[PDB]
Design a protein around this ligand. Structure first.
Ligand SMILES: CC[C@H](C)[C@H](NC(=O)OC)C(=O)N[C@@H](Cc1ccccc1)[C@@H](O)C[C@H](Cc1ccccc1)NC(=O)O[C@H]1CO[C@H]2OCC[C@H]21
Lengths: 99, 99
């Protein structure tokens, strides 16, 4: 679809069998989701933005469906204020910025 | 144009007559630039991000050109790690997400 930017570009995603709302974020290298207990091994990671760094759990080869488009990649889990879909997954659904 | 997300969507902007590189960021409500000397009056403000809050200088009704597209709106100046063009200006240049 086409998503305008008058409001936060929030969409429904499916991950680990759950539905969630997430921000499509071209300014994020990586995908970061609110605390959830996902099965599997994980690696510790630090990610930063405005204001500093937070500690997260890195899960690899996680499937996520974003408005019916499927993507598979690394998903980070930690105390973020909002679920963020980053470029590592946006590229897989064919997402572009246009103006 | 149409911009893919395999790399960071960095573009050249012109503000206060100076050229800079900035990230087109659908995940930012507001535009935030690294320290610069901008003409005009300003008011202190705080904005938050993934790591917490930073102190910024809010400049209103600033002219900025983003790959030749003109916008006039609020620009925050402060210790951000990267120059970010947020939705308040992306909307003025007609930017949408498409997939
Ligand atoms: C991938 C890890 C991080 C998510 C990612 N870092 C990364 O990719 O570094 C490599 C990252 O922080 N990206 C941000 C831009 C950015 C800043 C610093 C360095 C690199 C890129 C932005 O795209 C997402 C962020 C999401 C958000 C967080 C908290 C509350 C609401 C929304 N928005 C945001 O901070 O916005 C500010 C500015 O406007 C205001 O509205 C929203 C809050 C205010």
């Amino acid at each position: 679809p086409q998503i305008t930017l008058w409001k936060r570009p929030l969409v429904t995603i499916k991950i680990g069998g759950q539905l969630k709302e997430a921000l499509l974020d071209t300014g994020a290298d990586d995908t970061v989701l609110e605390e959830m207990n996902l099965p599997g091994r994980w690696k510790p990671k630090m990610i930063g933005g405005i204001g500093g760094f937070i500690k997260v759990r890195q899960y690899d080869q996680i499937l996520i469906e974003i408005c019916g488009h499927k993507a598979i990649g690394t998903v980070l889990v930690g105390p973020t204020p909002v679920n963020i879909i980053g470029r590592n997954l946006l590229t897989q659904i064919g997402c572009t910025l246009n103006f």
